[PDB]
Design an enzyme around this catalytic site. Sequence first.
Site, PDB file in Angstrom:
ATOM      1  N   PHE B 140     -91.126 -12.634  20.865  1.00  0.00           N
ATOM      2  CA  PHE B 140     -90.889 -13.376  22.116  1.00  0.00           C
ATOM      3  C   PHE B 140     -90.736 -15.095  21.367  1.00  0.00           C
ATOM      4  O   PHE B 140     -91.710 -15.460  20.776  1.00  0.00           O
ATOM      5  CB  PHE B 140     -91.565 -13.696  23.258  1.00  0.00           C
ATOM      6  CG  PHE B 140     -91.179 -14.640  24.180  1.00  0.00           C
ATOM      7  CD1 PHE B 140     -90.379 -14.481  24.992  1.00  0.00           C
ATOM      8  CD2 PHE B 140     -91.981 -15.726  24.198  1.00  0.00           C
ATOM      9  CE1 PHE B 140     -89.779 -15.438  25.945  1.00  0.00           C
ATOM     10  CE2 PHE B 140     -91.856 -16.885  25.250  1.00  0.00           C
ATOM     11  CZ  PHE B 140     -90.568 -16.839  26.084  1.00  0.00           C
ATOM     12  N   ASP B 226     -93.402 -17.721  13.455  1.00  0.00           N
ATOM     13  CA  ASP B 226     -93.420 -18.197  14.634  1.00  0.00           C
ATOM     14  C   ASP B 226     -94.649 -18.694  15.039  1.00  0.00           C
ATOM     15  O   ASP B 226     -95.180 -17.797  15.811  1.00  0.00           O
ATOM     16  CB  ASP B 226     -92.695 -17.625  15.531  1.00  0.00           C
ATOM     17  CG  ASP B 226     -92.567 -18.323  17.058  1.00  0.00           C
ATOM     18  OD1 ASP B 226     -92.583 -19.717  16.954  1.00  0.00           O
ATOM     19  OD2 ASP B 226     -92.179 -17.697  18.110  1.00  0.00           O
ATOM     20  N   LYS B 255     -94.762 -26.632  21.480  1.00  0.00           N
ATOM     21  CA  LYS B 255     -95.993 -26.487  22.628  1.00  0.00           C
ATOM     22  C   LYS B 255     -96.828 -27.632  22.173  1.00  0.00           C
ATOM     23  O   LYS B 255     -96.772 -28.731  22.523  1.00  0.00           O
ATOM     24  CB  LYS B 255     -96.323 -25.272  22.867  1.00  0.00           C
ATOM     25  CG  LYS B 255     -95.447 -24.329  23.739  1.00  0.00           C
ATOM     26  CD  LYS B 255     -95.748 -22.821  23.606  1.00  0.00           C
ATOM     27  CE  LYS B 255     -94.536 -22.054  24.346  1.00  0.00           C
ATOM     28  NZ  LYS B 255     -94.454 -20.831  23.938  1.00  0.00           N
TER      29      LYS B 255
HETATM   30  C1  LIG Z   1     -92.875 -18.212  19.035  1.00  0.00           C
HETATM   31  C2  LIG Z   1     -92.504 -18.650  20.323  1.00  0.00           C
HETATM   32  N1  LIG Z   1     -91.147 -19.425  20.177  1.00  0.00           N
HETATM   33  C3  LIG Z   1     -90.563 -19.784  21.304  1.00  0.00           C
HETATM   34  C4  LIG Z   1     -91.367 -19.991  22.393  1.00  0.00           C
HETATM   35  C5  LIG Z   1     -91.021 -20.719  23.711  1.00  0.00           C
HETATM   36  O1  LIG Z   1     -90.616 -22.030  23.489  1.00  0.00           O
HETATM   37  P1  LIG Z   1     -89.696 -22.950  24.446  1.00  0.00           P
HETATM   38  O2  LIG Z   1     -90.169 -22.275  25.653  1.00  0.00           O
HETATM   39  O3  LIG Z   1     -88.194 -22.650  24.233  1.00  0.00           O
HETATM   40  O4  LIG Z   1     -90.147 -24.392  24.329  1.00  0.00           O
HETATM   41  C6  LIG Z   1     -92.404 -19.424  22.488  1.00  0.00           C
HETATM   42  C7  LIG Z   1     -93.540 -19.765  23.695  1.00  0.00           C
HETATM   43  C8  LIG Z   1     -93.112 -18.579  21.471  1.00  0.00           C
HETATM   44  O5  LIG Z   1     -94.403 -17.855  21.624  1.00  0.00           O
END
Ligand SMILES: *Cc1ncc(COP(=O)(O)O)c(C*)c1O
Lengths: 402, 402
Positions: B140, B226, B255
């Site tokens: 995700f 990620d 985040k």
């Molecule tokens: C690895 C990873 N990449 C993106 C997101 C979602 O981020 P946004 O809601 O687009 O700011 C998640 C949470 C994640 O684990």
Amino acid sequence: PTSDDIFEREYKYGAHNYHPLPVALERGKGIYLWDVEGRKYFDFLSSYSAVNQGHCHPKIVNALKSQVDKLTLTSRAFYNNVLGEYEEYITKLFNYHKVLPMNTGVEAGETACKLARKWGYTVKGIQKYKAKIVFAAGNFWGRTLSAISSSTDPTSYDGFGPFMPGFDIIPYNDLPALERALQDPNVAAFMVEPIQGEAGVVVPDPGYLMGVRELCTRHQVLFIADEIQTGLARTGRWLAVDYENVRPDIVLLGKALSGGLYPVSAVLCDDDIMLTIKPGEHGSTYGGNPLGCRVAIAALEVLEEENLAENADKLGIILRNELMKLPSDVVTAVRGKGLLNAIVIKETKDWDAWKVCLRLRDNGLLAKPTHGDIIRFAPPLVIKEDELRESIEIINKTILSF
Amino acid sequence: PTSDDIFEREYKYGAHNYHPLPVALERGKGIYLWDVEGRKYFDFLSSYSAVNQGHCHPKIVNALKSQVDKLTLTSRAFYNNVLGEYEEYITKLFNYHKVLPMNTGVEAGETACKLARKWGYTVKGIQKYKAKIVFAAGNFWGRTLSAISSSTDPTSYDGFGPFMPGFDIIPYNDLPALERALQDPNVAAFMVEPIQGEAGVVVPDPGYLMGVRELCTRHQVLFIADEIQTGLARTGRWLAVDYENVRPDIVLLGKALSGGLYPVSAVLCDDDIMLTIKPGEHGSTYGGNPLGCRVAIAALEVLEEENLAENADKLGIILRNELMKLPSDVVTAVRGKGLLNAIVIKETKDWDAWKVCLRLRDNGLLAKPTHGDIIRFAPPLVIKEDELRESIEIINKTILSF
Ligand SMILES: *Cc1ncc(COP(=O)(O)O)c(C*)c1O
Ligand SMILES: *Cc1ncc(COP(=O)(O)O)c(C*)c1O
């Protein structure tokens, strides 16, 4: 702490994805921007209409400072008391059933695309994963893979892997082309900008928006209006489509929705289109956070009852009437609506649009060239008539110096 | 101004894209959240690790309040004095050549994908628009069209039009599958999470990250990590890959990069990969704004010299050792790293994970269920040992009440 140190240090520790104008702005309020050496400049870009209410509008700053002491982000896995308050305010403002909150402009367009596809499969009856979305040539709604896949600008898509299927491209400001394209029942939506800003402020002919609505309704196609840049009082109305009394199926908002203090974007549409996305089938982490919702309510209120739409309308009329007095051999065309305008430069090897913006920066005005021969003028909507006329005098002084 | 009014009003004026837990939080500081009726709750979700430094950490708030009075957004068409300062700080912190600033997590993944493809065409020599990117099953990295195209979760991609080509899916925690997949010379990169959080905190076996690096280097493939959720001191280190001394080619951050006060994300990689994107070939409007850069510098400083990585490491060791004392017939498994942990619930028709989080909310603890049988525990890294043990006592009190 000088300017060239900022230039070289960003060049050394930052990605080379931009070629910005050589000026290191440090302060900003209203329509003015100050660099690190103290020089003052007129802001005639408005961060691509992101600070329509001016840099650091006080009411938006107060709402941000008030909410940062209370709550900032809880994630949409729980409820908060501010998100719904902003939702009701913006839905009753633009008179739509529901709104979906995202952060950036790309996300608003991605949400509109997924809404249109889900609607085409669950409502229109399109065989699954065969739906298509139509885009106007020269469009710009961000720089994701899906966004660059529908772009006709090579600098946006060239070298970025395979491309998104189901994206059709028709010429902008073309009713016959849209009518020919909407003959395919697999077409779910047609996304278009009321005024193509990133292409050089290309204004369509009068009646184009009415024809797009008539064609989308007649052929059961979702009208998507990307008002992220054109909307919010810049062109003279809440939405640019309001100039022709057109109600799009889906409306996109961004940038000026927060006055430059927070990434807030919105997707507005009715129930039969919005409720196609079930719980847990779309969203964003920061999408709909309380802080961004507070600054969005503040930005919309200072857009409404500070009188900026008609302000931008009359000042844009003055702006265009004044720009058209320059000789026709140096300024090819002058177009625009509200405080979103642009001029065309008869580009040669003697000069181009970049050198003009450099000399404009030397005379105290910051503008953005989009093609080497097109120069955009978009000051914040809080500008006044005397300030506007002083700015145009800087424009004429710069142009007549070549 | 009650809670059920907030629930029904969001249901009436907001999109139904979420099914959140019935609680309307109004205030938040540190590890505590207060709803509108005044009830106090332990925050064990941390907004999906977005507020690792706690809700409204004072140093981040002061940096935001200081910068909002000076400058907020100028767009990357000009320079500003703060963006480069944040760029140098984060590049020297994680020891990479350059960083590319975006806003949300989706944009960081989209930037990594476009970097990998551009690199595969201009450096690796792949025939244009034939490159492919490998993703681990159950991943995700957001909810754009490209993000849902590489997802194995039907609730994310079902009904959302055709899908992005060039995306291959291999099982997570699988060295032979990655080795078989990287045999295709058209494969440009492999994006993976060091700990798959949204899938239920799935921790790979030790040595998986070292094997992924060895396989990516041996086959000339870009390792994309990620760390938007796993990074920034939650798992116990700056990056979760630091547990195995692995240096990925591209690192994603988000985040917690702002402590929940601003949407800020970053893409870190070296020169030969980053400089593949020429000026004007990628970017974002709010990407790299001065306000978000100030709060990002503040968030990284209060992550470093407030000692939160080893704090999350030891408290996570205590958290897991305490959770494993619950009987094996009600808690199937307990997994996690640092303060990012999860438990498995032997789901029946007598109970499920949603009813547990409801009863946990009734006892003063907010948690998030991800599959009806998996419950995640991730309190802010500013939590202390006595507060953690009181929270676990609420967890045991809730579990032992069924
Ligand atoms: C690895 C990873 N990449 C993106 C997101 C979602 O981020 P946004 O809601 O687009 O700011 C998640 C949470 C994640 O684990
Ligand atoms: C119509 C339209 N849509 C999106 C964008 C870019 O927004 P972000 O940079 O992604 O926040 C533009 C500016 C636009 O005109």
